[PDB]
Design a protein around this ligand. Structure first.
Ligand SMILES: Cc1nc(N)sc1-c1ccnc(Nc2cccc([N+](=O)[O-])c2)n1
Lengths: 296, 4, 258
């Protein structure tokens, strides 16, 4: 830590504060995450355990790079490549004009690449949200914050009390599935795709039931035809109202036929039929993908 | 249990 | 989604080689023995039962112990400290919420302090260089179970039993990668329950013929035959539960037809 000068606080992640820092010997600018570390009572938090072990395994252009781990008696620091902004804050600043469609396409393409790489290496991110998606000045976007990530060499059991996020949560979790699958990450990314396009959260629920119901109002209340098994899932109720599926030309007006098609496949109700990240990369929507740079 |  | 079944298996096959312990490390430990290790692992089986931990957590903890003891000499009075920190770390990695640290002090009958446990945690992270996502027998078995025609829950439970038994005895089981032990455990379980044999679909996928599994299998057959007389009995007691269809009450075949 002697070779780093803290410049400023840039944010917070899972159980740690993130600083912009510079290496005084090499000149490199890094992002330093200082883990909240209680040395007498609980030790190294499970978020830092998972983030370190999983990110050391994951070397990809669209996943944030862990450069180094500095582990002393009373402090734990993670050294990352520095990235300039998060997606949440970028879209707040691009509200009114909107993020240009070509840049939306590029970001989605890149996020799918990073996600596909995670999944092929048995890592579930589990908490994809714009605040965890990081951008640089050169047009790259990267997955960040692997604190809630899990290795799925054996299937991951769902949390009784979900800590993950309401708005980007898959309907199978809300209805009480016993395990996560890679499909939960596709669902979140579909929500983020729609959010970039329309300039607002697709499903801004205020509770779990309201979250389900906001999904039902846009996508239609699911049944055995659309989602075999749904009516015998732990938290399914026959008293659920019946809403009609909305035309995606109303849900995401700016988006063309290919975009609407991919979206609907990323928001498929049945986790077994929801499109995979690898398959999504083959979709015709990415035929004309380019790499524009954002105005930060 | 203490254990060797 | 089964789009990554192959990729994941291939990737686990690659990582199990990297997370492998040194095979002859106990010979170079001057104060501890295979037999002590066996007592330690057996105790951890029981701890996972008391605290209703997942079986993967046990498998992970053992992997962490053997890799730690591969580079660090440990006196017999501290071996339990190593195990306890391993189980804490595995629980943190694998469990939805781990038992509190205090619970890990209590399970040793307060032979160590909370601070000792936490600083052993730090030391284990240092020596393992934070590489905790190790493939296990339990992971390979879980993936092999997708190839049952049809799925049979005695087979699964008995294969898990046999997998766990192998954690207890460093000689011979440290010789074998987890995918190989899982292979032998699955065949022997399938054979024991139905008389069937290591399926061609798994021969294509693993690239393991039954013949290549033979050395590990003969070891595992003897272990299974001699399980009721073994000094360590926690796994047997564990698998008597209705949860597991009593498999450890089924009778082992006196011959493998090999
Ligand atoms: C490792 C890491 N985890 C996060 N969570 S953010 C983070 C990180 C890594 C690299 N660069 C950045 N920079 C950055 C810039 C702007 C905003 C935010 N944010 O935390 O709000 C982060 N943040």
């Amino acid at each position: 830590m002697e070779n780093f000068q803290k410049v400023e606080k840039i944010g917070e992640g899972t159980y740690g504060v993130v600083y912009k820092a510079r290496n005084k010997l090499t000149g490199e600018v890094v992002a330093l995450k200082k883990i909240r570390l209680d040395t007498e009572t609980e030790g190294v938090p499970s978020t830092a355990i998972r983030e370190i072990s999983l990110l050391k395994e994951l070397n990809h252009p669209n996943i944030v790079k862990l450069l180094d781990v500095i582990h002393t008696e009373n402090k734990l620091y993670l050294v990352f490549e520095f990235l300039h902004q998060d997606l949440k804050k970028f879209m707040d600043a691009s509200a009114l004009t909107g993020i240009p469609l070509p840049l939306i396409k590029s970001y989605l393409f890149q996020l799918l690449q990073g996600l596909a790489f995670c999944h092929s290496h048995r890592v579930l991110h589990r908490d994809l949200k714009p605040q965890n998606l990081l951008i640089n000045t050169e047009g790259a976007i990267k997955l960040a914050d692997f604190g809630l990530a899990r290795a799925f060499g054996v299937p991951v059991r769902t949390y009784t009390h979900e800590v993950v996020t309401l708005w980007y949560r898959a309907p199978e979790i809300l209805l009480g599935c016993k395990y996560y699958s890679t499909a939960v990450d596709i669902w979140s990314l579909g929500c983020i795709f729609a959010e970039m396009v329309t300039r607002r959260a697709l499903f801004p629920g205020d509770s779990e039931i309201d979250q389900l119901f906001r999904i039902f109002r846009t996508l239609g209340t699911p049944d055995e035809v659309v989602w075999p098994g749904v009516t015998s899932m732990p938290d399914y109720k026959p008293s659920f109202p019946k809403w009609a599926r909305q035309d995606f030309s109303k849900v995401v007006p700016p988006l063309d036929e290919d975009g609407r098609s991919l979206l609907s496949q990323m928001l498929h109700y049945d986790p077994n039929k929801r499109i995979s990240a690898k398959a999504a990369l083959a979709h015709p929507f990415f035929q004309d993908v380019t790499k524009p740079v954002p105005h930060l | 249990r203490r254990x060797f | 989604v089964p789009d990554y079944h192959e990729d994941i298996h291939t990737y686990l096959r690659e990582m199990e080689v990297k997370c492998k312990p040194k095979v002859g490390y106990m010979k170079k430990q001057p104060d501890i023995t295979n037999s002590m290790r066996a007592i330690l692992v057996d105790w951890l089986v029981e701890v996972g039962e008391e605290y209703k931990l997942q079986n993967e957590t046990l498998h992970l903890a053992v992997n962490y112990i053997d890799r730690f003891l591969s580079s660090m000499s440990v006196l017999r009075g501290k071996l339990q400290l190593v195990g306890t920190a391993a189980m804490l770390l595995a629980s943190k990695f694998e469990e939805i919420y781990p038992p509190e640290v205090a619970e890990f002090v209590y399970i040793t009958d307060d032979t160590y302090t909370k601070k000792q446990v936490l600083r052993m945690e730090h030391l284990v992270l240092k020596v393992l260089t934070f590489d905790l996502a190790a493939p296990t027998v339990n992971q390979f078995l879980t993936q092999y179970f997708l190839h049952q025609q049809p799925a049979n829950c005695k087979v699964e439970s008995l294969a898990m039993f046999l997998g766990e038994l192998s954690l207890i005895d460093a000689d011979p089981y440290l010789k074998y990668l987890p995918s190989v032990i899982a292979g032998a455990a699955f065949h022997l379980a399938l054979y024991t329950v139905t008389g069937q044999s290591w399926p061609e679909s798994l021969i294509r996928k693993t690239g393991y013929t039954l013949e290549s599994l033979k050395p590990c299998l003969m070891d595992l057959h003897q272990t299974y035959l001699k399980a009721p007389q073994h000094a360590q009995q926690s796994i047997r007691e564990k698998y008597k539960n209705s949860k597991y269809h009593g498999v450890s009450l089924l009778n082992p075949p006196e011959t493998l037809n090999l």
